[PDB]
Amino acid sequence: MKIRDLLKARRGPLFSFEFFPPKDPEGEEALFRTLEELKAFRPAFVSITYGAMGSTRERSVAWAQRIQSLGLNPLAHLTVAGQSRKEVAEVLHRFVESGVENLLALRGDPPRGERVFRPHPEGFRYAAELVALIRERYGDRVSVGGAAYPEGHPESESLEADLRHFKAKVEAGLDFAITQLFFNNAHYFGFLERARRAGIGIPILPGIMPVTSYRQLRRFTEVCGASIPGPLLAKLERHQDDPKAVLEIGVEHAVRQVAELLEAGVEGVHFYTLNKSPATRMVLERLGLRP
Amino acid sequence: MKIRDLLKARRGPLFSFEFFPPKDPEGEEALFRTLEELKAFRPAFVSITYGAMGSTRERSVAWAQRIQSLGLNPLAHLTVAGQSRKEVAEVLHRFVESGVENLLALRGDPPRGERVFRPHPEGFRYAAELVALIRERYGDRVSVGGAAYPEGHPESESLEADLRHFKAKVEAGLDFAITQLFFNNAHYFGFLERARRAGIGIPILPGIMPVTSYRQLRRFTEVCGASIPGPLLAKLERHQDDPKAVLEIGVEHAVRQVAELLEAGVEGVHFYTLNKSPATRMVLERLGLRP
Ligand SMILES: Cc1cc2nc3c(=O)[nH]c(=O)nc-3n(C[C@H](O)[C@H](O)[C@H](O)COP(=O)(O)OP(=O)(O)OC[C@H]3O[C@@H](n4cnc5c(N)ncnc54)[C@H](O)[C@@H]3O)c2cc1C
Ligand SMILES: Cc1cc2nc3c(=O)[nH]c(=O)nc-3n(C[C@H](O)[C@H](O)[C@H](O)COP(=O)(O)OP(=O)(O)OC[C@H]3O[C@@H](n4cnc5c(N)ncnc54)[C@H](O)[C@@H]3O)c2cc1C
Ligand SMILES: [Cl-]
């Protein structure tokens, strides 16, 4: 089921989960359990993450298929970094032909260290280019999506620039967008108004991550340039050594974030689960989104 | 000399500094040193903080007359916390008979560690009430600013309510607003849009604090509810013990910030100094201003 159509016909908002393809049998088993626990909430879509450089190629496809057989609806991430144009098309073809209908077109970061983006000698440079390619080969047979950044991409010269670019990418052929994570809703509302004023009208879904680790939260935000509210930061720091206390703080945080997000009429919420179920499960249950 | 008038007639952006009244001789001659250093930057106004719960009002009156007399242009802070209305009026009147033409009508906070605000038995409850009072007794003989919160006042139950209440605070009689500190310009641009969309057309000035102390940053943001970008936080974290590295970090960040703000044409920037001069000096100079 195309997400363009899922969004149009919405009786209500769409809740989606994000997962990454496990590196080892353990993780594979942790994911199987996670999907079981979560498929109960009846998500509109389910994302399968993609290793930049295309290292995890056959995993991402396998799991795209693993979710299909659970009767859920997959969203295939696809990046352009470290890959030829053929190589990017080949795996797109591999998705479509696995029956996948929904694609997040992403560029991907540069590797560890390495501060600037240099493409493959025959690869793409921007996500807008993969979106363009998708529409050119598949038109509307697939629903394409992209990344938005409420607090701006950490590489961008300005916020002016970051948004003009977001717009170019939408004009390339996006049907929706999902945001990078954010912990205070002003950041989303902020961006949404600024986008709509730029005459960008596609559905823009907030991405939410329920905090489960002080160390991870710090390390994640350092990479993607998101900011942690000072009260949350201190709360977490005071309790960082007690994993079940942290889980409760991250949940209470998400619950109250998501509750206003719903009250404000967002089209849906995309959940960064990190392949675990307790946090997202608890958030949804407290919101009354009843199994 | 009224900020309302200075804003209409502004040659370039209005730079301004915030100060608090010191507790002992040591911090007083420290503030005169800082006033001596920063005043060559020809600021449009200089603001002095208030107030223990009025407990330190003699000090703010003393400094408001002291900055007037240096031929700098005073913006006198006034809270309603822990005082009856009559009391709040008397002090207001001591400012205005001093020659002060500019007032920042504020509420003040509860004691550290209490969540709910509890007014004085015979006191005001909202900054707005102070605005109204000032306008009742002094019409437009003075100019009145109030605070704006780009990431929302912590006490506010929704971001739609915080704005709704800010606008009411504007319609009470505001000429300008100054924002609480932010470390990513998205917070501010986002807020500006939302406010115009709500039809608040007054000048809203970004308030910037160049980070000089890691623990200090961590304590203030916990209280005030602002967020710290991931990259900055890990940067500071790395170098927290070397004060002059941290100073270097806070400066390159605030420069990056103020530069873009100026290039987008804000009417001015308001600088949280902590009564120290180097950080703000360094930002203005790197920005190409001459002492
Ligand atoms: C929901 C979501 C899912 C993600 N999934 C993955 C994943 O599965 N695998 C993975 O590796 N990463 C993933 N990422 C991370 C993403 O790959 C990185 O943030 C990457 O750095 C940017 O991706 P992008 O598609 O937004 O890049 P782009 O949209 O191409 O932007 C790249 C940079 O160039 C700028 N730009 C755009 N167009 C132009 C132009 N024409 N001229 C000059 N500059 C331009 C943009 O401002 C930006 O700074 C995800 C991110 C999000 C938000
Ligand atoms: C630029 C700036 C300068 C500052 N200077 C000082 C200072 O000198 N001394 C000091 O102690 N503190 C100072 N502060 C801190 C400030 O006092 C605290 O943040 C205070 O808690 C906020 O009060 P306020 O004046 O902004 O607004 P308030 O109007 O007093 O807001 C308080 C709460 O009530 C809500 N509210 C407003 N009106 C209504 C209503 N009609 N009905 C229901 N709810 C309502 C608001 O959303 C908010 O959550 C300053 C803050 C800023 C941003
Ligand atoms: Cl000194």
Residue numbers in the entry:
A (entry chain B), B (entry chain A): 1 to 291
Copy text verbatim from the article accompanying this structure deposition:
The FAD-replete MTHFR has one FAD cofactor per subunit, forming a dimer of holo-subunits. In the holo-dimer structure, a β-sheet was newly formed at the intermolecular interface, which was designated as β7'. In the FAD-replete MTHFR that was determined from crystals grown at pH 8.0, distances of Glu18(Oε)- His270(Nε), His270(Nδ)- Ser16(Oγ), and O4(ribityl chain of FAD)- Asp109 (Oε) were estimated as 2.98–3.06 Å, 2.95–3.30 Å and 2.58–2.71 Å, respectively. While the catalytic efficiency for the folate-dependent reaction of the homodimer is decreased to ∼50%, we observed that all flavin cofactors bound to the enzyme could be reduced by CH3-H4folate by the anaerobic titration. Since the lowered activities of Thermus MTHFR were exclusively found in the folate-dependent reactions, the positioning of Asp109 could be responsible.
MTHFR uses NAD(P)H to reduce FAD; subsequently the reduced FAD reduces methylenetetrahydrofolate (CH2-H4folate). We demonstrate that the Thermus MTHFR is a dimer, rather than a tetramer, so that its symmetry is perhaps more directly relevant to the dimeric mammalian MTHFR.
